[PDB]
């Protein structure tokens, strides 16, 4: 639960709403804690510039090997939400991820996806069908994915929200993605060893590509330095199984 968070009250309102929605989706699942390296939960650091504060919450279920919700703030202005649900490869589910970045003048980036793990880069058919039924969402300011973003599905949303209506529409789309994903997790069957290996590789590739994101790395380096940032990206955020 988030009522004991020290960062929550100080974060951009869209981030607060989305954090609450993710927590509500997870709250009644068969959750167990997942221990991050060094049992990390709150961390703060500074070098010569602004302080970075991070709060981490992490869990697992039989179908999701690691469910990570991270809230962060740089200085007074830069607010971040990071969330990934890493699937257990045995069940073949896609990777849910989202990131919101906001400053004093509003949300600059809102990204969410259900990303594929199959070698053909397609989502399972049940997901394709359910996602197609939601309809194409209308947003005024779409952003093009960076080159390492070939890991994202055709349903990936990457926008700068233009107004509160778009903020709310984006949050609702993430809730819809999570409703689909949690339902599919109930009906998922354990796969063969060969198919498990295929899904494992797709997850490894997703993690290696996400480690190429210099926008994350520079924020971490400015507060903690190069070696800490590399450890954090490779062992805490995007760990290879
Ligand atoms: C400590 C955690 C953390 C930090 C410091 C972070 C920083 C961060 N991530 C992004 C962009 C940012 N983030 C993502 C996407 C993601 N990033 C993810 O971690 C996940 C799970 C996704 C997608 C599901 C993209 C694709 C981009 C745009 C990169 C670019 O423009 O080069 C920016 C630039 C925002 C803008 O251009 O408006 C910043 C400062 N993101 C974080 O999550
Ligand atoms: Na506009």
Residue numbers in the entry: 7 to 247
What did the published study say regarding this structure?
The D105N mutant, in which aspartate at position 105 is substituted with asparagine, was reported to be only approximately 10% as active as wildtype (WT) PcyA. Spectroscopic analysis also revealed that D105N receives an electron to produce BV radicals. However, because of the mutation, enzymatic catalysis does not proceed, as the proton transfer from the carboxy side chain of Asp105 to the substrate is no longer possible. In the previously determined absorption spectra of the PcyA D105N and I86D mutants, complexed with BV, a peak at 730 nm, observed in the WT, disappeared and increased, respectively. Neutron structures elucidated that BV in the D105N mutant is in a neutral state, whereas that in the I86D mutant is dominantly in a protonated state. Our quantum mechanics/molecular mechanics calculations of the absorption spectra showed that the spectral change in D105N arises from Glu76 deprotonation, consistent with the neutron structure. Glu76 and His88 showed different hydrogen bonding with surrounding residues compared with WT PcyA, further explaining why D105N and I86D have much lower activities for phycocyanobilin synthesis than the WT PcyA. The neutron structures of PcyA D105N–BV and I86D–BV at room temperature were refined to 2.10 Å and 2.00 Å resolutions, respectively. The R-factor and free R-factor for the D105N–BV structures were 16.51% and 18.00%, respectively, while those for the I86D–BV structures were 17.25% and 20.82%, respectively.
